[PDB]
């Protein structure tokens, strides 16, 4: 009822030029969240056991 649906149309945008800046931090911080997940994994398993 809001609108006749033709809303989403294909479009093109270029990929941002890569560098050392963001991937290394992205992956080390992913390491951080997965070390977190390991910690809560161990804690939950200990509580369950």
């Amino acid at each position: 009822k809001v609108v006749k649906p033709s809303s989403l149309n294909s479009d093109k945008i270029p990929y941002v030029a890569p560098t050392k800046k963001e991937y290394i931090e992205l992956d080390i911080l992913n390491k951080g969240w997965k070390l977190q997940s390991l910690n809560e994994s161990k804690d939950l398993l200990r509580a369950s056991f």
């Binding site: 070390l35 390991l38 910690n39 161990k42 398993l45 200990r46 056991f49």
Partner: protein, 108 residues
Amino acid sequence: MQPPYIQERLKSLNDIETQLCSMLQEASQVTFIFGELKRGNESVKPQFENHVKQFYERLDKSTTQLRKEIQLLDENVGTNKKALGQDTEKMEEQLDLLSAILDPSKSK
């Protein structure tokens, strides 16, 4: 009481679930130790090998013994009945009571 064979069968089964409980407990300690191993202290590193080896050897032989029990089930096949004599034994005891009634020197 039950014949002995059933007695050692139930003892072996009880040993089986106690071994399973020990396996679960050792899983708990190995999960515990891996956390600090990931933390970064290498002192408890030697204990890790021992814990893993004991965990695996506890997991294996328990299942092996249970397999032996299930195998025993295979050859144990072929290897109110009491009522057939029940009245008789009742009969016996009743007459015994009469004897106690019949002799006044034993009613003390």
